[PDB]
């Protein structure tokens, strides 16, 4: 009947009431305790969403949604699920007056089939008119770096974020493909950009003062097997009961991995990577051959050498071929911060890039780190899609005033239930202001006294309060996204307004 | 006690009132292995959930009759035999016996499937066309994921043209099969992309550096039950650790034997081996050399029907690759589906085959869940299109249970006897069928009902029937004010649907009327 | 015991146990075509339990 629709009404805004906060660049950020006692924050809707596990029907439906939102797209996982959801209470009042959830739901058919023909209108293809090359993206890092604490060395770090784009096929791009490394200590403005790939190096072990940070054209091999003798779980038990013959029966097992020198050696790789820590047996003679050696490396690391150089992983040292090695143009390690640093520079075919992040404190970083991310997904879809809209208040003010003069022309139920559809879209809006700590009272209805001039560009100010044109702000946002909005959020709504009753079974 | 009886149903039967028709709702069943899963289809929910009440499962037996035995009609059944026991509740409070009641319910039994002969006017001529199946499987595709109707039409109606075999007057031999005919589902892509293909499709992985074969016709594929493994003896022959000596003759043994028994089968010319169980790490390692595609099939179920399509035979040795055992199949190529690369098997024109794979795109997994389910239920109807009243049809959404109505209230006044209470009382439980229709679509209850009666009933001087009787349940929505005639989208009830129904739906009702008394344990 | 080199040698052993079976059923193909084998309306049923 209609109590478990009721029911269903909270369980949404109790999901949506999560990812309020985390609506924008500047809003809040949410706190979950995972099961496996690790702690977990972040912005994004598409991770707060993952880790919850909700058994609840309709707040999984929201949580499925967004994994679409971010597989076919990967932006705006938070505010589909906060559009989504604005329908549930929108459409509760609707329910005890006798209007069914059926016509509610054919009005969003049609209104949404209205508003995407508008956001084609509004998405202007604009590519060296009143803009060069290098100007273009650099002016578009410096929108999600605003009111930030890099406002001041925003300058320095802009250069470093175009590079990495630039650095890779404009045709294909990735956000995974672009690592970053927190190095703890240090100045913000003296951190450098890599071409190459880095780890994290923690490997502890003594040997150092050599493998100098100038090399020439080192070559890289991969290593599958422990170059250390020592057995970790094994053993075995030999005694003999003569006196003289212990001399001898202490001696020798060393001499069988003689018989992977010769193998390796003729090769002549001097980078020597594995996904296992490599032991204390030889730091040396690798480097009386100009051979480098790096143990404790993380196996996510160990797939970006393969893209880079070209190499590949053998289990033994006998079948490698020659061809599988590979070299950059120029090596370089830097002490500071307490711990040395290994990075690549100069690959001509590495298909990623890392980029190292310099701070006073690792907890300061990681709110550098994440803002970055905000501003690569504004560079990385301008060359990728020509077409744009006016965001940050602008689109979702027009979306709703279309609506309201459209519905005039409709007679029957479908009137009250599209103005209920422009008037769920102010939502999206509302949280911006409350985030950023503007007034959401004050700027509803001064933003609305502009907007209806004639002007469909008008947006939200997100450093001054104030109203005004987003243009001028450099604000720019994908049409791929608005688009896909509003047919992922009227989807998953469809879906939780048509089941009247929740059943669930044990066992 | 035969209230309570009919009130435990009465709770359950407005889950069923909202099953049948595109606006109507459904529900959401939690699986015992943590899995949500929703489908319109109430056969498929009634086998998921318990329920120990045994009056309930008369209605379930009563609807796996039209979920096998017929394409459609499993939420029509629920719908008749739920409505039949609230009716009854003014004769059994007048006094009346269970007797006149079951007895009224077969007398107007006859009188109704008399009438179902004159209520067909048009025919199948089964002429198997690609326009003209659009006509029988538009309607049971429908009423699930609304909208999606136009496109998923073609899909089913090109499938089930590739199944039925090319044959003229010949009625004896069935042609068409329910378990031929598999759907897939990969996420990603759109609806638009969809298409027909001739063949089961394999979206496993190609497991070695082959990914297809030549354009040639006729490739050889072997199918293999027994796994790749060394060749051994079939009396005794167990392979046992005693001395390292033998540890040498275990690892260079198997592969000499291994490439031995690879080397016969490539100079046949077999350019593919099927193995249903698991492959073995050094034979992917030969089969790469010799240009032969790796293919895993580890559902045993498959096999079976894959002997009807390429006419290759399992063999349960190994390394003896029998050519009368061998099959022949056009092309095997790789292509993306859903994102990812897939090895597609499918032919162009020699070796027609019967099995036909509807590939399908979306993003939801479980939107993709009910239209794999639909496919399923839509050409399970073309079993019911054979000489058994397959080509006759009857208008469908509330247009023949409205006009039922006026001709069994003509035989209630011409039947004497203490009858006349049940014929009337039989014509009003149809009234529930297009009252739900209107209620589902967001329209009033004081609206449909009263336009239908007016459109269905009229003062002609003359026998011969005017105007027009097929004045369905508009969903409205649309247009201005009124109805529509059903017939000119194409949407009709099929005979074989509809009369088979009608037993089920009161052979369901008589037996919980006929029973008193009930008694259980506690469980 | 089926001792084999090659899989095409196992078929010669094999088929040498299948003669017991080959060898009674032409004694029984040869009981329909002695009695009304050509006459119509005739047929020929094994039960084999």
Known sequence: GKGQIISNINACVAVQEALKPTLGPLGSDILIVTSNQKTTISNDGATILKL??????????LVDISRAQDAEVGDGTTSVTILAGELMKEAKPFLEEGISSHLIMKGYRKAVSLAVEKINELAVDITSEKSSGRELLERCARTAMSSKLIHNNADFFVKMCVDAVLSLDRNDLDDKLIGIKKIPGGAMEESLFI????????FSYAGFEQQPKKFNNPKILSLNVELELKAEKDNAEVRVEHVEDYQAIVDAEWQLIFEKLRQVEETGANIVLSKLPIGDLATQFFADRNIFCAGRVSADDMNRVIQAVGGSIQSTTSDIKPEHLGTCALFEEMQIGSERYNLFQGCPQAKTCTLLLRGGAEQVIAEVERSLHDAIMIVKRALQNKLIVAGGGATEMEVSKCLRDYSKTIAGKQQMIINAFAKALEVIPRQLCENAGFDAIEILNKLRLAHSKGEKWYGVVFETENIGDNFAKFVWEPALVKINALNSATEATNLILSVDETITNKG | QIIKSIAAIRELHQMCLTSMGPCGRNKIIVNHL????????????????????????????????????????????????????????????????????????????????????????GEITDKNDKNELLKMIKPVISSKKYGSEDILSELVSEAVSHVLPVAQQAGEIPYFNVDSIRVVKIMGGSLSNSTVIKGMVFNREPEGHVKSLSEDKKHKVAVFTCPLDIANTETKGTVLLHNAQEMLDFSKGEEKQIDAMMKEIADMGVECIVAGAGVGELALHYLNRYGILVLKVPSKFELRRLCRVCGATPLPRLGAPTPEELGLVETVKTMEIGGDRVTVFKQEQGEISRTSTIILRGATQNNLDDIERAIDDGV???????????????????????????????????????????????????????????????????????????????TEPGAVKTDHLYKGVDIDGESDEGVKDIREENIYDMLATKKFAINVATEAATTVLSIDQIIMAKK | ?????????????????????????????????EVCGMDPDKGFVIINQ
């Open chain 2, 380 to 458: 399970a109807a073309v079993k019911g299109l054979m000489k058994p009243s397959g080509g006759k049809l009857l208008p469908g959404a509330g247009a023949t249970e409205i006009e039922l109505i006026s001709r069994i209230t003509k035989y209630g006044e011409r039947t004497p006897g203490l009858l006349q209470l049940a014929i009337k009382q039989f014509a009003v439980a149809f009234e529930v069928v297009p009252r739900t229709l209107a209620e589902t679509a967001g329209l009033d209850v004081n609206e449909v009902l009263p336009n239908l009666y007016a459109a269905h009933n009229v």
């Open chain 2, 34 to 121: 943590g899995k949500i899963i929703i489908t319109n289809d109430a056969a498929t929910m009634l086998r998921e959930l318990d329920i120990v009440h045994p009056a309930v499962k008369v209605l379930v037996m009563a609807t796996e009759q039209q979920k096998i035995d017929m394409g459609d009609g499993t939420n029509l059944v629920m719908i008749l035999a739920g409505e039949l026991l609230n009716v009854s509740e003014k004769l059994i409070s007048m006094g009346l016996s269970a007797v006149e009641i079951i007895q009224g319910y077969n007398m107007a039994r006859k009188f109704t499937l008399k009438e179902l002969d004159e209520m067909v006017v």
């Open chain 1, 52 to 61: 919850l596990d909700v058994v609840h029907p309709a707040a999984k439906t």
């Open chain 3, 1 to 33: 015991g089926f001792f084999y080199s090659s899989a095409d040698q196992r078929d010669k052993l094999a088929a040498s146990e299948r003669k017991f079976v080959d060898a009674k059923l032409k004694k029984i193909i040869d009981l329909k075509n």
């Open chain 1, 195 to 202: 071409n190459g790939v880095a780890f994290k190096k923690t």
